[PDB]
């Protein structure tokens, strides 16, 4: 009758090795497990819970809609999805929006759009997708092939063709591969799963120029960096560089699964009826929640609060690092932050993460070499201080 | 300030041409638009709203969970997702489950699993996927290439390689393509988007034998046919044939986006840590709702009620067809039903569907030649009678 962690190994296809403990409830940046142990949540659902757990406003938005209707599919549109498209359109470089269920699906849409756009304006010979080493764009066949970790793509071959990977942050690597045959350049403004590595300002200017020069669409995968995470609504705003396509998901639904492709008028025009689609994308429920999310997150008091919190994190992480000497650098932007291990401790991010869990704070990794922080954007000063106290206890246990 | 249908053409990437009217609320099999016109909903969200609109029980399940927590991502499991895995395991041939956000993602998982399984037990040369003409498996690059409507895949080339299509319901077509190099045979037990065409009993026995003989995994895409739609929990039960992998989505979450891959112990074992994944899949919210759905749908009174309703539909559709002579045949199973147009009216399913909307009933199409019905499983006798009255009015207007 009771549910146990041993139940997980018996019943789930074993793609994840999750925590020994099982969460049963949360509020804000706190989470509790079956035994009532209390965690401070700096993982934030992997950058998804931008307003923390069980937020009262997301809850009324969800239940208000849920009492009218949840879903019709896309033969019918709805008021929530349309208010949401509008909020996005007004807030970003975008003119049109397409909604779906996840980051992976949004990137699939973006790449398909790019392929179609080049076939239609230039010719069927123009198919190349240029992405970057260590990129993560999701787990579908297409998006994992565009993603730059061959370990996640090897087994599933033959992979869609005409994808090449340049070195992140290397403008020369990219120009080597970008030419008149390229339809798309897909890039994360900050590499998330790949070590929390920010783009340099030059690198994104350079890509934009290469795109212009060669008529490829520039796609920014802001699935991990979007919706306030950097201190601005999107990273493209921080950098000053405008993409042709922008994918967003994750924080956008603050816990409810949703993704979006933002596009210029020129690009959208090309996706005609029946050329793509989704069954659940743009449903009333998801749209009512993301709508509320945008409204709460897209305010100067929140966004400025993100930069404030960045400083809380960085200051205290350095104090900590000065004492214990784990990290060679602390990097990232707003509230996507990475502590990179120095060579003494290389490859042990996971162990530190497990130590943190024992001390009662949830952090992530980003490769074996980086401890990743992605707390809720409305994380309180007190939760930050407590959670960093626990993280420090953890670093102590770990150093031995 | 008010939201209008003209707003849809201004703001959405135009992949859908939805209805002139916009739904604002529903209850059961009734839906209302902005002007308060009343529709009977035989489209049921494209076979998704198995318990109709804004169902009171789905609502408390949703709000109960939503007050504990919505999401952590998969470094952490949860009680809802585990109760759900268990319900499924107990109810089906499956031993293990993997959860995701949609049918498309579930099929991506299934095919990737199959590719990996063959690479691991036989060798990297064994990669072939055999699917069928007119199959629909979703809109990712991989699943649309496995899908059998070249119009939806052409523009996005180069497509993943080693996919071939046999003729549905043709055992000889399939044996021509299935050999020792095949890793997977993916099939819909009833082709949904492709004309509501049921599989013959022979055809699925035959595929199962071919699979066994050649060591390919048999995958049944029950995304459209699963969760009661046929009168049994899944179509594989109606047919007597057990697949190796089963994908399900759609009705499973009764409106909330969710998909699942059901697998035998032998197959699951092969998907090791980090080989696949999803950010939202298996989240508490989705799992609490599908859990309730399964509990309401997987009962002899519902399932038997589905067969009862099948008869209501078929009887009255024939009365109607005898009067107006639109349809050459009425086909399908349980509450997935197709009225196939005779040659006089070929290609005009969409027009009939538009006539139906004017008369105040929502039906679907399945190609230009078939009017498709997928009402909620708990559709009441009265809603069925009223909606078929309106459908009949519609058929009258249409015949001229």
Three-state SS for B172-216 is HHHHHHCCCCEEEEEECCEECCCCCEECCHHHHHHHHHHHHHHCC
Beta bridge partners of A12: B97
E strand or H helix at A296: helix A284-297
Q: State whether residue B24 sits within 8 Å of chain A by CB.
A: yes
Cβ pair B226, B253 in contact under 8 A? no
Prior bond of A158 cis (ω within 30°):
yes
DSSP at A109: H
Q: At what angle do helices B284-297 and B56-66 cross, to 10 degrees?
A: 150
E strand or H helix at B86: helix B79-91
Prior bond of A100 cis (ω within 30°):
no
In this structure, what are the phi and psi dihedrals at residue A96, rounded to the nearest 5 degrees?
-135, 155
Distance separating alpha carbons of residues A50 and A376, to the nearest angstrom: 4
Distance separating alpha carbons of residues A184 and A206, to the nearest angstrom: 14
- Tell how far CA B134 is from the center of its chain: 14
The residue behind tokens 């591969």 is A177
Helix (H, G, I), strand (E, B) or coil at B262: strand
Q: Tell me the nearest-neighbour CA distance from B202 into chain A, angstroms.
A: 31
C-alpha dihedral sign at A209, A212, A216, A218: positive
Return the biggest CA–CA distance within chain B. Answer: 63
In this structure, what are the phi and psi dihedrals at residue B286, rounded to the nearest 5 degrees?
-55, -40
Length of chain B in terms of residues written: 400
DSSP at B12: B
Taking an 8 Å cut-off on Cβ atoms, the answer to whether B75 and A46 are in contact is yes
The residue behind tokens 């009826």 is A273
Tokens standing for residue B318: 């024939």
Tokens standing for residue B286: 């989705």
Per-residue buried b or exposed e for A359-392, using 16+ beta carbons within 10 Å of the residue's own CB: bbbbbbbbbebbbbbbbbbbbeeebbebbbbbbb
- The candidate with the shortest Cα–Cα distance to B82, out of B90, A258, B113, is B90
Chain B 47-106, CB below 8 Å of chain A: which residues? Answer: 48-49, 53-54, 58-59, 62-63, 66-79, 82-83, 85-86, 89, 96-98, 101-105
C-alpha dihedral sign at B258, A255, A81, A79: positive
Distance separating alpha carbons of residues B289 and B309, to the nearest angstrom: 24
Q: Which residues from B are below 8 Å from A22, CB to CB?
A: 76-79
Tokens standing for residue B130: 């055999």
Question: Which residues lie closer than 8 Å to B396 by C-beta, 6 or more apart?
Answer: B324
Distance separating alpha carbons of residues B11 and A268, to the nearest angstrom: 10
Compare CB distances from A79 to B24, B63, B277 and report the shortest one's residue.
B24
Cβ pair B5, B34 in contact under 8 A? no
User: How crowded is the C-beta side of B372, counted as CA atoms within 13 Å?
Assistant: 23
Tokens standing for residue A283: 């449903």
Distance separating alpha carbons of residues A307 and B194, to the nearest angstrom: 52
E strand or H helix at A220: strand A217-221
Beta bridge partners of A7: none
By CA distance, what is A261's nearest residue in B?
Answer: B13
Taking an 8 Å cut-off on Cβ atoms, the answer to whether B272 and A15 are in contact is yes
A369: phi > 0 → left, psi -120 to 50 → alpha, else beta; which?
Answer: alpha
Query: Beta-carbon neighbour count of residue B36 at 10 Å?
Result: 8
Q: Which residues from A are below 8 Å from B12, CB to CB?
A: 77, 82, 85, 96-98, 282
Q: State whether residue B32 sits within 8 Å of chain A by CB.
A: no
Query: Beta-carbon neighbour count of residue A108 at 10 Å?
Result: 35
C-alpha dihedral sign at A103, A109, A111, A114: negative
Length of chain A in terms of residues written: 400
In this structure, what are the phi and psi dihedrals at residue B387, rounded to the nearest 5 degrees?
-75, -35
Taking an 8 Å cut-off on Cβ atoms, the answer to whether B86 and A285 are in contact is no
The residue behind tokens 């009324």 is A60
Tokens standing for residue B283: 């989240």
Distance separating alpha carbons of residues A143 and A137, to the nearest angstrom: 5
Q: State whether residue B159 sits within 8 Å of chain A by CB.
A: yes
In this structure, what are the phi and psi dihedrals at residue A320, rounded to the nearest 5 degrees?
-50, -50
Question: Which residues lie closer than 8 Å to B197 by C-beta, 6 or more apart?
Answer: B134, B168, B169, B190, B191, B331, B338
Helix (H, G, I), strand (E, B) or coil at A163: strand
- The candidate with the shortest Cα–Cα distance to B53, out of B256, B284, B285, is B256
Query: Beta-carbon neighbour count of residue B299 at 10 Å?
Result: 12
Distance separating alpha carbons of residues B146 and B143, to the nearest angstrom: 5
Q: State whether residue B30 sits within 8 Å of chain A by CB.
A: no
| Domains defined for chain B, CATH in brackets | 1-54+301-400 (3.90.1150.10), 55-300 (3.40.640.10)
Distance separating alpha carbons of residues A3 and A60, to the nearest angstrom: 29
Question: Which residues lie closer than 8 Å to B116 by C-beta, 6 or more apart?
Answer: A155, A156, B270, B271, B275
Question: Which residues lie closer than 8 Å to B236 by C-beta, 6 or more apart?
Answer: B93, B189, B220, B222, B242, B243, B246
Beta bridge partners of B372: B338, B364
Q: State whether residue A45 sits within 8 Å of chain B by CB.
A: yes
Cβ pair B222, B236 in contact under 8 A? yes
Q: Are strands B217-221 and B182-187 parallel, antiparallel or unpaired?
A: parallel
Taking an 8 Å cut-off on Cβ atoms, the answer to whether A16 and B62 are in contact is no
Distance separating alpha carbons of residues B186 and B400, to the nearest angstrom: 42
Cβ pair B210, B174 in contact under 8 A? yes
Angle at B351 between CA B347 and CA B355, to 5 degrees: 150
Tokens standing for residue A32: 């509790």
Q: State whether residue B9 sits within 8 Å of chain A by CB.
A: no
Distance separating alpha carbons of residues B49 and B251, to the nearest angstrom: 6
Q: Which residues from A are below 8 Å from B257, CB to CB?
A: 101, 257, 280, 283, 286
Question: Which residues lie closer than 8 Å to B342 by C-beta, 6 or more apart?
Answer: B325, B326, B327, B328
DSSP at A41: E
- The candidate with the shortest Cα–Cα distance to B243, out of B269, B216, B270, is B216
Cβ pair A102, A259 in contact under 8 A? yes
Distance separating alpha carbons of residues A20 and A354, to the nearest angstrom: 10
DSSP at A167: P
Sheet of strand A370-373: strand arrangement: A327-333, A336-341, A370-373, A364-365
- Tell how far CA B180 is from the center of its chain: 30
Q: State whether residue A265 sits within 8 Å of chain B by CB.
A: no
User: How crowded is the C-beta side of B43, counted as CA atoms within 13 Å?
Assistant: 25
Distance separating alpha carbons of residues B87 and A11, to the nearest angstrom: 10
Q: What is the secondary structure of B274-285 as a DSSP string?
A: TSS--SSTT-HH
E strand or H helix at A39: strand A38-41
Tokens standing for residue A278: 């989704």
- The candidate with the shortest Cα–Cα distance to A257, out of A295, A290, A221, is A290
Q: Which residues from A are below 8 Å from B3, CB to CB?
A: 79, 82-83
By CA distance, what is A2's nearest residue in B?
Answer: B79
Q: Are strands A217-221 and A245-248 parallel, antiparallel or unpaired?
A: parallel
Helix (H, G, I), strand (E, B) or coil at B318: helix
The residue behind tokens 């049994």 is B232
- CA–CA distance from A40 to each of A100, A251, A342 (Å)? 31, 18, 26
The residue behind tokens 């939202």 is B280
**Structure determination technique employed:** X-ray
Tokens standing for residue B193: 């988007």
Q: Which residues from B are below 8 Å from A48, CB to CB?
A: 71, 73, 279-280
Helix (H, G, I), strand (E, B) or coil at A362: strand
């Amino acid at each position: 009758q009771p549910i146990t962690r041993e139940n997980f190994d018996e019943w789930m296809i074993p793609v994840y090795a999750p925590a020994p403990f099982i969460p049963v409830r949360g509020e804000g940046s706190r989470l509790w497990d079956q035994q009532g142990k209390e965690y401070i949540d700096f993982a934030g659902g992997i950058a998804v819970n931008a307003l923390g757990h069980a937020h009262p406003e997301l809850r009324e938005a969800l239940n208000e809609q849920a009492s009218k209707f949840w879903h019709t599919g896309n033969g019918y549109t709805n008021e929530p999805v349309l208010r949401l498209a509008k909020k996005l359109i007004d807030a970003t470089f975008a003119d049109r929006v397409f909604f779906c269920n996840s980051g992976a699906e949004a990137n699939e849409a973006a790449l398909k759009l790019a392929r179609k756009f080049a076939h239609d304006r230039y010719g069927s010979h123009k198919s190349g997708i240029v992405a970057f080493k260590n990129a993560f764009h999701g787990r579908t066949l297409f998006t994992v092939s565009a993603g730059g970790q061959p370990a996640y793509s090897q087994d599933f071959a033959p992979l869609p063709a005409d994808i090449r990977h340049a070195a992140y942050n290397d403008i020369n690597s990219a120009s080597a591969l970008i030419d008149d045959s390229t339809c798309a350049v897909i890039v994360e403004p900050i590499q998330g799963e790949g070590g929390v590595v920010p783009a340099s300002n030059a690198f994104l200017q350079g890509l934009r120029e290469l795109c212009n020069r060669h008529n490829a669409l520039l796609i920014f995968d802001e699935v991990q960096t979007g919706v306030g995470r950097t201190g601005e609504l999107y990273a493209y705003m921080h950098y000053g560089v405008t993409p042709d396509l922008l994918t967003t998901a994750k924080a956008l639904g603050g816990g409810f699964p949703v993704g979006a492709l933002l596009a210029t008028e020129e690009c959208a025009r090309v996706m005609t009826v029946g050329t793509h689609g989704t069954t659940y994308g743009g449903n009333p429920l998801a749209s009512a929640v993301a709508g509320k999310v945008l409204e709460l997150i897209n305010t100067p008091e929140m966004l400025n609060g993100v930069k404030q919190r960045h400083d809380w994190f960085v200051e205290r992480l350095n104090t900590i690092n000065h004492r214990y000497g784990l990290f060679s650098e602390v990097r990232g932007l707003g509230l996507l932050i990475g502590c990179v291990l120095n060579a003494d401790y290389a490859g042990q991010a996971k162990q530190i993460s497990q130590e943190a869990a024992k001390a009662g704070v949830m952090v992530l990794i980003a490769g074996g070499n980086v401890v990743r922080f992605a707390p809720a954007l409305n994380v309180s000063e007190e939760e930050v201080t407590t959670g960093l106290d626990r993280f420090a206890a953890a670093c102590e246990h770990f150093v031995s």
